[PDB]
Design an enzyme around this catalytic site. Structure first.
Site, PDB file in Angstrom:
ATOM      1  CB  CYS B 101      58.270  99.071  25.886  1.00  0.00           C
ATOM      2  SG  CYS B 101      58.479  97.579  25.052  1.00  0.00           S
ATOM      3  CB  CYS B 104      56.116  95.260  23.025  1.00  0.00           C
ATOM      4  SG  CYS B 104      57.384  94.700  23.939  1.00  0.00           S
ATOM      5  CB  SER B 105      53.252  97.392  26.011  1.00  0.00           C
ATOM      6  OG  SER B 105      53.403  96.017  26.280  1.00  0.00           O
ATOM      7  CB  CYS B 106      58.440  96.269  28.310  1.00  0.00           C
ATOM      8  SG  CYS B 106      58.235  94.891  26.954  1.00  0.00           S
TER       9      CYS B 106
HETATM   10 FE   LIG Z   1      57.090  95.934  25.862  1.00  0.00          FE
END
Ligand SMILES: [Fe+3]
Ligand SMILES: [Cl-]
Ligand SMILES: [Cl-]
Ligand SMILES: [Mg+2]
Lengths: 212, 197
Positions: B101, B104-106
């Site tokens: 991601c 972000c971090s998905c």
């Molecule tokens: Fe993310």
């Protein structure tokens, strides 16, 4: 928003701090670290105060140097706090009083967002598309490395979701769109300066147009 | 110039956020503690490993997993938050898939677990989309020149898992035995399943 959070392709970082299958430790490394996600969900599901999209955007709205020096879970503490203040649920005074010190928040938005596009196209697997050459100051789920670039559709989702650029600002006109797995050749994105093959970006219909 | 802002300790800030909301009646009893338990005990890469082992030993399920990942995951009851629309991506003798991601971090939480710290690092987020071969090498995974690397950037609601190739030396293993070698990093795509001697 062309913020520092749009990191893909940035050069100058060092090694990833991991070797495969190394111990990552417990899920939470401190006793507060479950709070940001839990309280995000309280806000989304229990209070109805904001969407997950608004959480992504408020983290994008951290002042850039602040973003760059803040650990991951702390960014979401800051972001959820910010939304609670902006929505009128909490005050910054009460947060700082309870915290016993400063609690700086993300910066105010500089865009009201934009609606789901009126004119879009339903694409098919195998079709060639270009990412629309547009600049959006508010939230957008398009990393800049693919803006204006051409790739081919690998998947059209069978579900649809609100347009991020609208729901990430709490707007009423996010509509719904499918997204598309768009496969780009590495050279299309980074010229000769890549060691990869392809990159697949999951792009909302409203970011795409037919290739020439 | 460029200095950090003054901040109370993060733990104090996080608990201040909790107390401010809790003290207004906005957080149900047991709510954050319930989420903590879900995140610690339920969302787990053991689930994605179960799905890979099933796919490896059941051609029909493999086909389902690759064509309608949501449906396949639902059979096991493993849909959930950040894991409602699932796509499994197949490694082959000429293709290695890797997930990130960049924004972000998905991550497909219910079947991979919450992301590890390294996956959320600026180094991974910046570099793997541009130089995945070198990133994987540095991490301990050599991907040969005959193999296209394909990076999936988790930019919308699709939540991905990698279906790694099944290594030689595992013929006839039980699903439990196979699961043991499908690690979190195999599901993310930075590692290949390892067979002991
Ligand atoms: Fe993310
Ligand atoms: Cl070039
Ligand atoms: Cl169009
Ligand atoms: Mg940029």
């Amino acid at each position: 928003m062309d913020g520092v959070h749009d990191l893909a392709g940035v050069q100058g970082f060092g090694k990833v701090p991991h070797t495969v299958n190394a111990d990552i430790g417990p899920t939470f490394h401190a006793e507060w670290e479950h709070l940001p996600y839990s309280l995000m969900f309280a806000g989304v599901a229990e209070l109805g105060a904001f969407s997950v999209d608004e959480v992504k955007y408020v983290v994008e709205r951290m002042e850039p140097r602040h973003y760059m020096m803040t650990p991951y879970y702390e960014r979401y503490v800051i972001g959820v706090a910010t939304l609670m203040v902006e929505k009128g649920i909490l005050t910054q005074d009460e947060l700082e009083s309870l915290a016993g010190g400063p609690f700086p928040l993300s910066r105010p938005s500089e865009s009201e967002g934009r609606p789901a596009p009126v004119e879009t196209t339903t694409f098919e697997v195998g079709q060639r598309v270009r990412v629309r050459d547009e600049y959006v100051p508010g939230h957008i789920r398009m990393p800049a490395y693919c803006r204006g670039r051409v790739g081919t559709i690998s998947h059209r989702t069978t579900e649809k979701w609100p347009f991020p650029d609208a729901i990430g600002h709490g707007r009423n006109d996010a509509g719904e769109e499918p997204t598309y797995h768009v496969k780009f050749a590495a050279e299309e994105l980074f010229g000769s300066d890549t060691d990869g093959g392809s990159v697949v970006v999951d792009l909302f219909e409203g970011y795409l147009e037919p290739a020439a | 110039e460029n200095a950090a802002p003054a901040q109370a300790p993060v733990s104090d800030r996080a608990w201040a956020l909790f107390r401010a909301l809790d003290g207004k009646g906005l957080v149900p009893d047991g709510y954050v503690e319930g989420w903590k338990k879900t995140f610690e005990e339920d969302f787990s890469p053991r689930r994605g490993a179960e799905l890979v082992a099933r796919a490896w030993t059941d051609p029909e399920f493999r086909q389902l997993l690759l064509t309608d990942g949501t449906a396949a995951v639902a059979q096991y009851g493993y849909l959930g938050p950040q894991g409602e629309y699932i796509v499994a991506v197949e490694d082959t003798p000429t293709l290695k898939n890797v997930i990130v991601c960049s924004l972000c971090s998905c991550t497909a939480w219910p079947i991979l677990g919450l992301p590890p710290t390294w996956y959320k690092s600026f180094e991974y987020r910046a570099r793997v989309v541009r130089e995945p071969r070198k990133v994987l090498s540095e991490m301990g995974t050599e991907i040969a020149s005959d193999i296209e690397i394909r990076v999936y950037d988790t930019t919308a609601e699709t939540r991905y898992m990698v279906l790694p190739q099944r290594p030689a030396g595992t013929e006839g293993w039980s699903q439990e035995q196979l699961q043991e070698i499908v690690t979190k990093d195999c599901l993310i795509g930075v590692a290949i399943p390892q067979v002991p001697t």
